[PDB]
Design a binder for this molecule. Structure first.
Ligand SMILES: *[C@@H]1O[C@H](CO)[C@@H](O[C@@H]2O[C@H](CO)[C@@H](O)[C@H](O)[C@H]2NC(C)=O)[C@H](O)[C@H]1NC(C)=O
Ligand code: BEF
Ligand code: MG
Length: 1055
């Protein structure tokens, strides 16, 4: 369905439109452009696809008419005859000239036969390499880093900077130099900050998504160790490192076995066994099989070759085509951030432009009736447009976020993109990773069972509360420990077990001498007669152990429960061993087994110690079992309950097993004991029968759902109507692929849920960018992509960023309300003066613009977040009855007092009118200017104090002493100005008033409007929402998640 079109034109015609916009640089274009789509469509000069140096791709969703617009450069390269390559949306769409056909990177994706992959065990020197490299492109992730000119162009293409620049020109023209310099300086430094941040962001990501590992190849001639880095071709075969080898390219393993750490994919420290592709004739690609594939970014811990000379793999995916490349494409090209407040602030500024344009018509007529010069009419009419749309408005709202950023830093949460703190305020749902976020990134021994009798014994809770005997020794001598500088090294679970015991690790074959903690209530510090390894097939290690007791030594063994019991004799094995095994596995806890065979072998003799491995691992007694598991964290259980009390929904998005995810979720408090969990599983589609959504009730001592990654896939692909019902009710998503996690967050925010994500890192990076609020608990990798970063490795950050966000959103509303009110009060005063051939003089505008507004705007933004989180959430709607009625009624009182002041001044018998002939600036002192200025001066001070509500989301206003001190000092200067004959009246060009009565009446009008303003906010706060409930009590939200919740409450989904 993509709309792909070719392009060419006359060079003079392209230069002509370059004269129209490229000379302009676009900044006038958008100043004259609502949106570029109309311009974009045919700005470019069209042709056939071949002629096209740039190809317009307009991708349509047929169902929703989602006609997204793109324009993409044509790559021309010679293999030996030029082939046409198009780098669309990152990925390579390859055009064959002969068939006039666009083809994707899935060139051979179909017909990747299991046997065919097996056949390609050797790759040709040049004749395959060069052509394959040309067709598929190079094996590296090449993110282009944008130049400061290109960045400056697109940042400066924002319309508000263009309005600020126009504003700067009119200020410069009308001699308003001081304030203009402040506006210019604030603008310029914000642009510099923005460009630096955007470059730095790209620079670290480009650095981070790069790997320079010198590697071998399997060309039949060419097998040179470290032959190349990025030169790998998708078809090529490779030899692996024997130990500790990071995988550069996604490749199927042709022969040998491997043990690999899939940290990138599963978020697991444990290894995964990898086996050779099993020989088959069908279209048996490694992708679908998913056991015979080494995915890119993963570490090979151990490589082993037995059936051939060395381990062998064939490449499958390279560069942007690999899954890691999919994640890089996911973090790039990001979905635009859509918020109600942000659009509504722009819409309110649009309404101000209409009101300003209407204002200019009144200004132009009244100035012509006033009979001013032609030049004056253009300057003063445009000046009024700059008053109605306040040019410092963006800078004001930044001050709110700038304070919160600093507060968060002191608590230890580090924040790039300060504006995103506000998004925190509106979070309804927060997603959480399990391993490293909510569950401690490590396995700890829950306990061991003794097996004193033939039947199993009750479990021992604490290994530190040790009983001396064969179990004590079995823990001591069952170890795979290496040597570092007074430090243990090897399998972390085995390393943990040696610490659990309290033992210390320091004959001709004796290694790693084993000692007690040296506390006494017979400690018998033990030695190892022989040691036999943990082979992947074996699933077990047998360690023969000699005590200093003058007794013949016995073999003590550790392994998997199945294998250990299978090798153990059935008389020794318990009857319910399998049932206990089943209980711990199904419960999700790890099951490991300890067993022993007495050895007729002589002490200290190498010959006697040496045996056949299977001879040593022959017929054994079951010594007992060991159980280890993740322990949640200290702070996890508290926070999740507080999130539940707040009614901010909690979702577990993990890469682990479903059964494990359930038990952590139950312990965590994602699902309460009274609450009911339903397992939802759906099979793959068949020609014979459709894919069946099998819903299973899960019994246990707000009914919600549990998914697997495959099941989630089957719901999105084969049940699109039901997916909404699953997303609004699902609480635990298990075995989720790194891409699938981002698609969950994308589909959640499609339903009009605001979405946050908490992440350990490297599996969740895609989501951390994709989510509205992304908090990385790692200092590594995730930090680069994540909007926010924490140092505490805890869910504890989420409460703090919620609280700060709620406060900052409330502060941002108040600062907007004030700046809008400030705009309109100056518009009311300047209109009333303009009719009389007067205007608020220069340095009277400056005082208002700098010392009153910038002080109160930057001191009302200081208020800290409220101590307790509450069920009620801040409003999102800047275009709402509550805000608009507040602005309207406050402005009616503002207008009323100012007009009341004027007509009162006119009435008094000492009153004298002005010249009304010479210009508004030339009449420097006048009673009308003095009374308008004096009354207006206080109203800016008053409004700032009233609009700040404080308590439910922020600290109490009476706590914020500097704002009250600043208000008091500014109140003292303004009351001083009117009451005293002014030393400062000379600078501001005011007229001192003899009549104390009239001065006290003018204070009378001010003190009235203070009480009026402070009351009316309280009246609307306590009445207007209640009065709305009377008008409509059943106003259901357009938010789709709310509608689906209402629907589910009426008709419940499969009960
Ligand atoms: C407003 O100011 C103007 C300018 O000072 C006044 O007009 C001047 O009046 C004096 C007489 O004292 C003449 O010498 C000037 O020639 C006049 N100038 C102009 C430009 O006409 C005007 O009288 C003042 N308005 C009022 C009501 O007194
Ligand atoms: F490592 Be997490 F549980 F996806
Ligand atoms: Mg994890």
């Amino acid at each position: 369905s993509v709309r792909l079109s070719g392009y060419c034109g006359s060079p003079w015609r392209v230069i002509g439109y370059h004269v129209v916009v490229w000379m302009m640089a676009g900044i006038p274009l958008l100043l004259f452009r609502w949106k570029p789509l109309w311009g974009v469509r045919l700005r470019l000069r069209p042709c056939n696809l071949a002629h096209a140096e740039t190809l317009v791709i307009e991708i349509r969703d047929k169902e929703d008419s989602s006609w997204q617009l793109f324009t993409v450069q044509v790559q021309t390269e010679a293999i030996g005859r030029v082939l046409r390559y198009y780098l669309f949306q990152g990925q390579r769409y390859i055009w064959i000239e002969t068939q006039q056909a666009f083809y994707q990177v899935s060139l051979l994706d179909h017909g990747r036969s299991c046997d065919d992959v097996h056949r390609s065990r050797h790759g040709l020197s040049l004749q395959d390499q060069m052509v394959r490299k040309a067709i598929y492109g190079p094996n590296v992730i090449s993110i282009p880093v944008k130049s400061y000119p290109q960045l400056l162009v697109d940042e400066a293409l924002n319309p508000y900077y263009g309005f600020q620049a126009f504003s700067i020109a009119l200020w410069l023209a009308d001699h308003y130099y001081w304030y203009a310099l402040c506006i210019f300086l604030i603008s310029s430094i914000s642009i510099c900050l923005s460009l630096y941040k955007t470059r730095k962001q790209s620079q670290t990501l480009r650095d981070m998504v790069k790997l320079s590992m010198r590697v071998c190849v399997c060309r039949p001639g060419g097998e040179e160790e470290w032959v190349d880095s990025s030169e790998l071709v998708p078809g090529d075969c490779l030899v692996l490192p024997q130990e500790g080898g990071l995988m550069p390219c996604d490749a199927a393993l042709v022969a040998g076995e491997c043990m690999v750490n899939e940290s990138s994919l599963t978020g697991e420290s444990i290894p995964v066994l990898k086996t050779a592709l099993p020989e088959g004739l069908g279209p048996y690609c490694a992708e679908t099989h998913r056991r015979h594939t080494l995915f890119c970014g993963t570490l090979i811990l151990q490589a082993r070759a037995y059936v051939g000379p060395h381990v062998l793999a064939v490449v499958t995916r390279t560069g942007f085509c690999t899954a890691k490349g999919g994640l890089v494409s996911s973090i790039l090209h990001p979905r635009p951030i859509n918020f109600k407040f942000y659009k509504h602030s722009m819409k309110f500024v649009a309404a101000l432009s209409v009101l300003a344009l209407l204002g200019t018509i009144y200004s132009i007529f009244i100035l012509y009736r006033n009979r001013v010069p032609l030049n004056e009419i253009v300057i003063r009419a445009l000046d009024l447009v700059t008053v109605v749309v306040p040019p410092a408005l963006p800078a004001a709202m930044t001050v709110c976020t700038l304070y919160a950023q600093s507060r968060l830093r002191r608590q230890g949460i580090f924040c790039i993109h300060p504006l995103r703190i506000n998004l925190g305020g509106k979070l309804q749902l927060v997603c959480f990773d399990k391993t490293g976020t909510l569950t401690e990134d490590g396995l700890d021994v829950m306990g061991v069972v003794p097996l004193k009798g033939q039947a199993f014994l009750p479990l021992v809770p604490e290994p530190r509360r040790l009983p001396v005997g064969p179990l004590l020794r079995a823990l001591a001598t069952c170890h795979a420990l290496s040597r570092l500088q007074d430090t243990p090294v090897g399998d972390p679970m085995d390393l943990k077990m040696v610490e659990s015991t309290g033992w210390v690790l320091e004959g001709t074959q004796v290694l790693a001498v084993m000692r007690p903690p040296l506390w006494e209530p017979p400690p018998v510090p033990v030695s190892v007669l022989h040691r036999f390894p943990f082979s992947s097939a074996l699933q077990r290690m047998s360690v023969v152990v000699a005590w200093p007791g003058a007794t013949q030594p016995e073999a003590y063994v550790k392994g998997s429960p199945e294998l250990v019991a299978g090798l153990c004799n059935p008389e020794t094995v318990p009857t319910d061993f399998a049932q206990m095994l089943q209980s711990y596995t199904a419960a999700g806890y790890r099951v490991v087994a300890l067993a022993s065979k007495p050895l007729p072998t002589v002490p200290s003799l190498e010959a006697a110690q040496q045996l056949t491995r299977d001879t040593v691992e022959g017929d054994l007694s079951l010594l007992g079992l060991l159980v280890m598991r993740n322990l949640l964290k200290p702070q996890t259980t508290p926070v999740i309950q507080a999130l539940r009390r707040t009614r901010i929904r909690a979702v577990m998005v993990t890469g682990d097993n479903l059964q494990t995810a359930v038990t952590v979720a139950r312990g965590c408090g994602m699902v309460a004991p009274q609450e009911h969990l339903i397992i939802v599983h759906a099979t793959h589609p068949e020609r014979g029968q459709p894919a069946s959504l099998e819903f299973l009730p899960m019994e246990s001592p707000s009914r919600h759902l549990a998914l697997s990654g495959p099941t989630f896939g089957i719901i999105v692909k084969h049940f699109p109507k039901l997916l909404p019902k699953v997303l609004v009710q699902g609480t635990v998503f298990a075995r989720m692929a790194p891409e699938q996690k981002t698609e969950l967050v994308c589909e959640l925010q499609k339903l009009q849920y605001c979405v946050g994500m908490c992440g350990d890192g490297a599996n969740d990076c895609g989501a951390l960018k994709a989510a509205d609020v992304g908090i990385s608990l790692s200092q590594a990798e995730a930090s680069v992509v994540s909007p926010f970063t924490s140092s505490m490795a805890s869910i504890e950050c989420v409460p703090m960023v919620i609280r700060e966000g709620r406060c900052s959103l409330d502060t941002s509303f108040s600062v907007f309300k004030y700046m809008a009110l400030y705009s309109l009060t100056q518009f009311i005063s300047v209109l009333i003066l303009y009719t009389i051939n007067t205007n608020l003089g220069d340095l009277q505008f400056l005082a208002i613009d700098l010392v009153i507004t910038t002080t109160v705007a930057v001191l009302m933004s200081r208020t800290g977040p409220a101590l307790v989180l509450g069920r009620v959430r801040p409003p999102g709607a800047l275009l709402s009855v509550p805000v608009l009625s507040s602005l309207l009624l406050q402005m009616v009182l503002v207008t009323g007092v100012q007009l009341g002041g004027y007509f009162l001044t006119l009435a008094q018998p000492w009153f004298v009118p002005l010249n009304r002939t010479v210009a508004a600036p030339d009449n420097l002192p006048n009673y009308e200017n003095t009374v308008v200025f004096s009354l207006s001066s206080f109203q800016y001070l008053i409004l700032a104090a009233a609009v700040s509500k404080g308590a439910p989301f922020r600290r109490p206003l009476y706590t914020n002493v500097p704002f009250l001190v600043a208000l008091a000092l500014l109140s003292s200067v303004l009351v001083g100005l009117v009451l005293v004959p002014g030393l400062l009246q000379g600078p501001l060009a005011l007229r001192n008033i003899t009549d104390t009565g009239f001065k006290l009446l003018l204070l009378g009008l001010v003190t009235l409007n203070f009480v009026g303003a402070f009351m009316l906010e309280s009246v609307l706060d306590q009445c207007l929402p209640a009065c709305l409930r009377r008008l409509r009590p059943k106003r259901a939200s357009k938010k789709r998640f709310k509608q689906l919740e209402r629907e589910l409450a009426e008709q419940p989904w499969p009960p």
